[PDB]
Design a binder for this molecule. Structure first.
Ligand SMILES: NCCc1ccc(S(=O)(=O)F)cc1
Ligand SMILES: [Cl-]
Lengths: 437, 430
């Protein structure tokens, strides 16, 4: 009748078995079993002799940082089990950590097509929208390695959670975190394709609980990277009461309509305002809607999105992010004097407009021929190439500061006639344009 | 297959890979190579007396295109006579540049609240409908074709409706709907059937856009072009993953929008971008080139819940909305009401998550109001009849009514001046 909770399995259980559960806060719930792995039971609680169990707990400690764990929080790094400061329920009920404050202030990802044009702010949920065969995992990993909060008095941490991945992918992520030293400031949760589906379902909840704990109890800005929500959804649609039931039809369980919202609700500035939880969920377009209907991923898209584009990938460009369909709705809260730089908005606006114009002119060029294009139009056409070649394109290991990003922006903007810079205040042209300054 | 596609009248027999000249609207010629052909239309890939010099494929242009149903090649499909042209216009877009260097602006009333209210369509904009297999994007497209208008515009309004690769049953349905509602009288309708030559499918949006340019520029009209659907267009390129040149080819479609020279007309596009239900047989194309001014998102969640039209405003966006709203265009309170409904709906939807974490009875009284607001938004604002044509006033007033469910002190996005003037609890009866 109510919330799904996650319980430590201590004996075999049957479908719809009535159970009593001891919660993290010491209270008890009664509920019904939906599904189970070897170690975990999924229980749907009721409001207000049988099996008595305890909830599955995150072993919460600052010593989570530097560790690589399974989806259930068990070590994968050869290290000892986490010694907990606190044992926390994982479904979101623990801590009540979120403030009623808007997201704000800069997270530097080091990727120009995010920081420059679609800025990530602390407390935001900003999905990466992608598809099979595109390098969204590479982008996610690069952000994990590079992200920081310039000028903040609060410490920064990363929670990286990968779901449904292959053995070789897991080995790769582990090696990357270890060799780069990104592991020092990260908690890494790795769920394998062949791990139990219930473990996959618990994975983002373990990750979000760790993030909330570090943000709220330790005053950290925490960035949570979740790759891939689509993979999570493929497990969900075959778990418990959803098994062989069809979305929108009789028999499809109500919790399937709100499950994704239990994940996307969990982001924001935390109480005290010294910390925050920011999410970058990867949403890969599944390709199999007809055979594998999943919960609508649109619910996760309320504060913008970063779009990975096959066009740019096929051009040989990494990261292949198309800024034009990309958006950060909270960008203005994270940029400008004292955050990035005063000319940030102006430079972003002008690059966006110039790139959009240049891309339209690729069409016009095809319609009339290169020789028929005006000199002014040719400059914008060329600007779109410069934008893709110099601004969009950056190394896998290239961590650009926002100043680096804005400088590249100004350099490519010099290709346009100064009189065509309609989105940039004259004050910023005089102060920052390379032909001046 | 590298160069851009140009369409040429079949006036003489041609062969594959034959090198040809194409005569352009200004008397110059471009050189190309024959890629493919139907009986009447040659597809040339362009580069950079002795050889074939071809004429561009032409639209027979006249105001009498209005009220007609044509094929993708412009031939009558309505039993009527062939169009008698005032002009023969190159459909490749090259003989005439009607577009002004002006930003899109001013209101197009679709009559659909989740467009007009929260992500307003403006004249000259390209605003795709982003949808997927099994969703009612075609119903939405037809509803917009029936309902759209430009309130208070001195310029007359027309619709160009182009459907690509459709079944005979869909064709009959579209024709019937245009005819019986009278929507046909202000429209030029281009219907390309699935079994029509693939060449005619790729010519279809170019015929449509040429018709819209002619009406907009030569007759001072605001023209709304509805193109359904681009995924099917992309598949025709495939049967002629996707070819590399597709991205440039799409730009030849999406460049063709905006206010026209003189600013008494415009070409606005609503392309339908539908994601295939089966990746294996119908690969997912990168149509993101078309998405530069926002998107209207058709959502499975809302469709599953039995709501029409199933538009989720939160991922939807109109980048140019501010240029189409307010005093003299819609109403002064538009931006505030939109901002507040968006914020309230987003908060309510997050609170659906919280309910599924802590249980409904654990929510605060305040949070419960926002939770209930999300239900009201979906049931009263999102939901509307297939033939329910809402004025912007109607949609703003629905908005105000549902906003009364929230505590007045929680209306952070609304200027006190608009609360005093328009909030049902304060507004004076006049
Ligand atoms: N197989 C279709 C290709 C084609 C079809 C027709 C011609 S033509 O007769 O009009 F010259 C040329 C090439
Ligand atoms: Cl859903």
């Amino acid at each position: 009748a109510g919330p799904l909770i996650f319980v430590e399995k201590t004996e075999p259980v049957g479908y719809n078995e009535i159970v009593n559960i001891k919660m993290g806060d010491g209270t008890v719930r009664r509920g019904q079993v939906l599904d189970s792995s070897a170690d975990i039971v999924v229980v749907q609680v009721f409001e207000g002799v049988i099996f008595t169990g305890e909830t599955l707990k995150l072993p919460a400690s600052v010593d989570l940082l530097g560790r690589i764990l399974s989806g259930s929080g068990e070590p994968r790094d050869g290290g000892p089990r986490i010694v907990p400061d606190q044992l926390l329920d994982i479904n979101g009920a623990a801590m009540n950590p979120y403030a009623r404050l808007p997201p704000k202030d800069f997270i530097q990802t080091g990727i120009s097509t995010i920081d420059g044009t679609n800025t990530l702010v602390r407390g935001q949920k900003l999905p990466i929208f992608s598809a099979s065969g595109l390098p969204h995992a590479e982008i996610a990993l690069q952000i994990a390695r590079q992200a920081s909060v310039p000028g903040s008095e609060s410490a920064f941490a990363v929670v990286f959670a990968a779901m449904g991945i292959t053995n070789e992918e897991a080995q790769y992520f582990m090696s990357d975190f270890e060799k780069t030293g990104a592991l020092e400031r990260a908690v890494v949760f790795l769920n394998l394709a062949d791990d139990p589906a219930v473990e996959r379902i618990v994975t983002p909840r373990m990750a979000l609980t760790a993030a909330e704990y570090l943000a709220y109890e330790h005053g950290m800005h925490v960035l949570v990277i979740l790759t891939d929500i689509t993979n999570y959804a493929e497990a969900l649609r075959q778990m418990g009461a959803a098994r062989n039931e069809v979305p929108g039809r009789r028999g499809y369980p109500g919790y399937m309509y709100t499950d994704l919202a239990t994940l996307y609700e969990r982001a924001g500035i935390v109480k005290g305002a010294k910390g925050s939880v920011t999410q970058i969920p990867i949403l890969s377009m599944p390709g199999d809607d007809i055979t594998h209907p999943i919960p609508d991923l649109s619910g996760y898209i309320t504060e913008g999105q970063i779009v990975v584009a096959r066009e740019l990938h096929r051009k040989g460009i990494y990261p292949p992010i198309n800024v034009l369909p990309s958006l950060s709705r909270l960008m203005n809260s994270g940029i400008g004097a004292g955050k990035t730089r005063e000319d940030h908005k102006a430079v972003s606006d002008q690059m966006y407009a110039g790139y959009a114009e240049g891309r339209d002119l690729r069409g016009l060029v095809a319609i009339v021929g290169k020789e028929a294009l005006s000199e002014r139009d040719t400059k914008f056409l060329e600007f779109a190439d410069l934008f893709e070649d110099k601004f969009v394109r950056q190394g896998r290991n290239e961590n650009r500061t926002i100043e680096d990003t804005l400088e590249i922006g100004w350099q490519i903007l010099t290709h346009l006639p100064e009189n065509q810079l309609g989105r940039i205040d004259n004050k910023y042209i005089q102060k920052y344009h390379p032909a001046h300054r």
